[PDB]
Design a protein around this ligand. Sequence first.
Ligand SMILES: O=C(O)CCC(=O)C(=O)O
Ligand SMILES: [Cl-]
Ligand SMILES: [Fe+3]
Ligand SMILES: [Fe+3]
Lengths: 291, 306
Amino acid sequence: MNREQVEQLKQEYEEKGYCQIKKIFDFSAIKTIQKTLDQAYDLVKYDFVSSFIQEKLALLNYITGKNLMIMHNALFSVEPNHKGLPWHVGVGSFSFTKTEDFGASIWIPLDKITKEHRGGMQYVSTKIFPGQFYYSVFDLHLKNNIKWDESQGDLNEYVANANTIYNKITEDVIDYTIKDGYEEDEYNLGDAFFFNKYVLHQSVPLKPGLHKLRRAFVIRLVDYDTRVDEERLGLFSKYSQLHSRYYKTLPRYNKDSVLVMVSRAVQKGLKSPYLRDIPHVQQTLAARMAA
Amino acid sequence: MNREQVEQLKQEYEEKGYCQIKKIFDFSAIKTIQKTLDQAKQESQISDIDTNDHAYDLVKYDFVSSFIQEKLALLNYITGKNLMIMHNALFSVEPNHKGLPWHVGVGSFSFTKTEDFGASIWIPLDKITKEHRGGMQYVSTKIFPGQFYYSVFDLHLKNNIKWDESQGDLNEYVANANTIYNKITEDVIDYTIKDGYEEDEYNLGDAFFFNKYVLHQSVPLKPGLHKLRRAFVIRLVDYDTRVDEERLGLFSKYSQLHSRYYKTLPRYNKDSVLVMVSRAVQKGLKSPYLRDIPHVQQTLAARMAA
Ligand SMILES: O=C(O)CCC(=O)C(=O)O
Ligand SMILES: [Cl-]
Ligand SMILES: [Fe+3]
Ligand SMILES: [Fe+3]
């Protein structure tokens, strides 16, 4: 890659907590991947992406000053007239990590992103919105969640109506906070968006013209020294009991395979705080990291 | 001290981010503080806060070390940090006033980096009783980890500073702005903390020690015991604590904006810490550390344990 550009991405990431990476991928590679798609198990279901990603870790490692390690490849596709989540920071996506420890993502659009037919992603520099504090707010919310009992009526409603700092930060309050100081960009194939977990962001809806759907890979990474958060996992388990005991069913986050994976390792007892030392991660280590 | 007590103190601070320390000052020290602050207070004119006295740096670092330096060892041990005396404040409340509302030390420790260490010793100069109260309430950082509140407050400050003549009265603009800061009302705090706060009785000689992420407020003083209740507060940082030029600039700009609109003239006690730091910064800093400020570096020995 153009060494001057690389130096600029490193500067930009250091400024905003994110950078758009133009031509990070060969068209070929995108078509390969795109073509293969056209062809407990959700954990590895897309590991064939890993190799494509692994070739780029050195770059990203340089850009961020971290030693990155792939956790999970998710395919995120959805119809054009789709209501997504409002600006958020991924307190859920990275619930398995210590808040202060490092986490980041690569958003890989499989279908072009145009000025028309937006259909991509908006994002706010962490200079403007240092997303870290949002994680603490969320944790306060989780702890309030597990205060519920039957005496207080419907569980989900209790949660939705609880007067918690989290619930207070409504879409308008966020909109008012960021105003127009966000970016949205155009993406040709083989372009990706890289952002750490403190970057407030949101998906934009797609115009009907083209294409059929908006397809993108989303890859979660952490750092070699990124630790688990046992207490948060405690919170989720405790909430999962209340939930099944009452709705006779499980919360939908048991569908996050990384969460499930990390939780089991934890319950089974953890010699170490590092995610790298979780047996399933450790076994596939070299595949998860830079050459 | 006892040794067994000292270990409970350490233990409590580790859990809650605070600890009440009973009988740490002797009555004589207290009387000295009273008299000295009473004199300093008479001399100068000072301007949802419902407090009588809100004076910063009425006395200097040397008067402070004179009764604090011999205690830094206990505090260093409790926090596992190396503490430097920095700035101070005197607060007082009359009966039936709310004093300060819930807050964390984002105002007090404004010119330092959020993640760097800051703590306070709150020394009541009038007895706090179960019957008349007028003390403080405080919340374990286990219940309310106050560090997040700093960003929230910084976002709000940044909005303050976008004010415009078009907007109308500055104070009203600030108070009604739809910022996250403004959303966190007393009701919200109440709902967040519940009954998890603690309120303790204090005899002269007792003090409250707390780091800057602890959420705390004044309690109303019931009439019939004291005409006024005073508390003297010492702010401490770590040897390695750094200046935050960015927040310092926000505060200056907002202060500037406020004085310009209201035609007020902010007075600072000579050798106010804030002023001292603002100059060093305005000159340009050689080092990030507070210790490497020239006035500090010169007076460092008095500021630290023996
Ligand atoms: O003395 C009071 O009522 C409040 C003091 C305070 O907020 C502090 O010492 O940080
Ligand atoms: Cl404070
Ligand atoms: Fe997201
Ligand atoms: Fe305070």
